[PDB]
């Protein structure tokens, strides 16, 4: 099929809310070894986010049931629930390894040293899915993925800070998810709050650098960063 029919199935699948098919189309596109456009990066990121996102949402529901029913004391149910949670964990892990394959083998690889914008995005994405794995991993397995998520975010942070405007949507989106990584995974609220505040302040400072093409996108992430900082600073006063 033509490469243009692929992306059109991606657009179509998105509207039909069939993200398994959307993530499949964009995978075929990616394997064509051609650099992805700005819309094509969007379609890929959304398709897999929805796929993996569903498993995460379910896994949280299942792991939740596993804590409420663990106090009951029925070993016939605790087994079937734990068995189910592992089923969802495998599905989730499968998707993550799939995207990370696309990233390291096709996307990140064919990025020249003047495609800062694309590389910062693919890396942030890579760090995101390694964090998803960290949400369901434990012990040495959890330690390895967290380290891999850090290495991805950290590198993306440097390339953004150096080659992107603080009002840039891609750089902003990185500061967000990266800060989320600290607070949730690393459990370092000070680092999470700081990175979120800084990325926000630095956006206000050079707020005149908003380009019309994507002012709406950049402005949107900024709300989330504050909504995050609000939510976080309210969780530190409960623990105290």
């Amino acid at each position: 099929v033509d490469r243009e029919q692929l992306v059109q199935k991606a657009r179509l699948a998105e509207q039909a809310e069939r993200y398994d098919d959307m993530a499949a189309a964009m995978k075929n596109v990616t394997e064509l070894n051609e650099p992805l456009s700005n819309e094509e990066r969007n379609l890929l990121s959304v398709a897999y986010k929805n796929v993996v996102g569903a498993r995460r949402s379910s896994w949280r529901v299942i792991s939740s049931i596993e804590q409420k029913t663990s106090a009951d004391g029925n070993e016939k149910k605790i087994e079937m629930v734990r068995a189910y949670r592992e089923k969802i964990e495998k599905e989730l892990e499968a998707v993550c390894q799939d995207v990370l394959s696309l990233l390291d083998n096709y996307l990140i690889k064919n990025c020249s040293e003047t495609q800062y914008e694309s590389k910062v995005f693919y890396l942030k994405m890579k760090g995101d899915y390694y964090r998803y794995l960290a949400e369901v991993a434990t012990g040495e397995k959890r330690a390895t993925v967290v380290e891999s998520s850090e290495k991805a975010y950290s590198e993306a942070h440097e390339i953004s800070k150096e080659h992107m405007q603080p009002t840039h949507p891609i750089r902003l989106g990185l500061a967000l998810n990266y800060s989320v990584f600290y607070y949730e995974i690393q459990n370092a609220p000070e680092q999470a709050c700081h990175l979120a505040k800084t990325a926000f302040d630095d956006a206000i400072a050079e707020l005149d650098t908003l380009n019309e093409d994507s002012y709406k996108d950049s402005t949107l992430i900024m709300q989330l960063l504050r909504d995050n900082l609000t939510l976080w600073t309210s969780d530190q006063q409960d623990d105290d």
Partner: peptide, 13 residues
């Protein structure tokens, strides 16, 4: 489980 807000989109046009 308690979660924060996140984003996964790039500027289309």
């Amino acid at each position: 489980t308690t979660v924060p807000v996140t984003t996964a989109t790039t500027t289309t046009t």
